[PDB]
Amino acid sequence: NFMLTQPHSVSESPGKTVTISCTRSSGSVASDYVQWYQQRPGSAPTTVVYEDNQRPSGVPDRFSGSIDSSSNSASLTISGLKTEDEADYYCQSYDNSSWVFGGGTKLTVLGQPKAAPSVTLFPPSSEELQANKATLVCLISDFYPGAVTVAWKADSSPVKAGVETTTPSKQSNNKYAASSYLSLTPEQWKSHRSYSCQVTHEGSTVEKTVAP
Amino acid sequence: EVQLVQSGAEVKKPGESLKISCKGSGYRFTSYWIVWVRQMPGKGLEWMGIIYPGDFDTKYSPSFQGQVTISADKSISTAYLQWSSLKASDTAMYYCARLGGGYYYLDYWGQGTLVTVSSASTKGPSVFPLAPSGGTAALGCLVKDYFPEPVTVSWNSGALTSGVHTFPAVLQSSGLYSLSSVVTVPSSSLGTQTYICNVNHKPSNTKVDKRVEPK
Known part of the structure; x- marks a missing residue:
């Protein structure tokens, strides 16, 4: 029933060395072999370490596993970091013929430019209004790191209802995008003088406004 | 070339049964354990179980025991994962992998099968x-x-x-x-x-x- 605990996120500059620890709650780590897996988003995992410290063919020698019996843990060590090493890393061991996975660690390779989001806000189309519906569309792109807060306003009053927002997702240029949708009746849209989309990122806010 | 090819993406409604597959080629299918792993959207890897096609020796993780059936058809080198009654929470990506090489590890992976379960x-x-x-x-x-x-x-x-x-x-x-x-x-x-x-x-x-x- 033992668990394997690893940090949620580690980060390091390229060229340097990062360590990911894996600690088991019960028993001694040396009792069962430990594997490490790498998984990039949208891809299947790959084995990078097995049998504590063995390296499967194809895997760069910059990857190495070790065991620290005193702290009852295993470690994945990546020297000479490269951007391709950005992924999720999972440790794995055995508990009487049953496999146990760690929670995973997201490795962030530092060095990427911090960028503020570009915001485009669209009012409801004339056609949508004919169908007795209304949707405001807030398109948020080219921001880094991937974390934003979206707030909607009717005139100057906050709007919580009818708001659906996506998770940030990585673009092709390694920056992040997201979008937010405010649902209104055509009557609400015609009622107010304006609606606003406020996007906050790293303490700074970009606000776009549209009017009927 | 060793290869594990899984079946295509599935969109289902809750209550439906589903059987997804993992087809082996380029090796002796009965001679290697097959592992099944679940990965829900945005979460980690969970071990579901393992099977040796040679004699149908099958082991399940506690959290999956009785929830799903792992099986194999020897004559066509295919391992399976099946549900009798899908739940919305079964929405996930499912991977199969071969335990192979003198100590073995997961050396080949299927491309994954996405299961989306919704009303x-x-x-x-x-x-x-x-x-x-x-x-x-x-x-x-x-x-x-x-x-x-x-x-x-x-x-x-x-x-x-x-x-x-x-x-x-x-x-x-x-x-x-x-x-x-x-x-x-x-x-x-x-x-x-x-x-x-x-x-x-x-x-x-x-x-x-x-x-x-x-x-």
Whole structure:
């Protein structure tokens, strides 16, 4: 029933060395072999370490596993970091013929430019209004790191209802995008003088406004 | 070349049974353990179980025991994962992997099978034009209230690719998806170049071509 605990996120500059620890709650780590897996988003995992410290063919020698019996843990060590090493890393061991996975660690390779989001806000189309519906569309792109807060306003009053927002997702240029949708009746849209989309990122806010 | 090929993506409703597959080729299928792993959207890897096709020796993780059936058909080198009654929470990606090489490890992986389980029924999208700083204009279309994914969006029948940004969909509380695609164009090209978003939604046999023009 033992668990394997690893940090949620580690980060390091390229060229340097990062360590990911894996600690088991019960028993001694040396009792069962430990594997490490790498998984990039949208891809299947790959084995990078097995049998504590063995390296499967194809895997760069910059990857190495070790065991620290005193702290009852295993470690994945990546020297000479490269951007391709950005992924999720999972440790794995055995508990009487049953496999146990760690929670995973997201490795962030530092060095990427911090960028503020570009915001485009669209009012409801004339056609949508004919169908007795209304949707405001807030398109948020080219921001880094991937974390934003979206707030909607009717005139100057906050709007919580009818708001659906996506998770940030990585673009092709390694920056992040997201979008937010405010649902209104055509009557609400015609009622107010304006609606606003406020996007906050790293303490700074970009606000776009549209009017009927 | 050793290879594990899994069956295609599945969209199902709760209560339905489902049997997904993992086909081995290029090796002695009965001689290697097959592992099944679950990965729910945005979460970690969970071990579901393992099977040795040679004698049907099968072990399940405690959290999956009695929830799912792992089996194998020797004569066609296929391992299976099956549910008698899908739950929405069974929505995940499922991987199979071969334990192989003197100590073995997961050396080959299937490409994964995405299982989406939802009470939503198939529905084509309503497409709305998003009508248009500097010599640059932004225009697009809103692809509203469809199920299931995916929708494919192109511009001018694939003729316009530069400056195109299609945003990943949102999943609304209604179980329906919505996305937007926006294209950035020279403002000088407005009214001299036609802009039409081609939205194809295969599951509902619906294709829409929406002309986008200034308000």
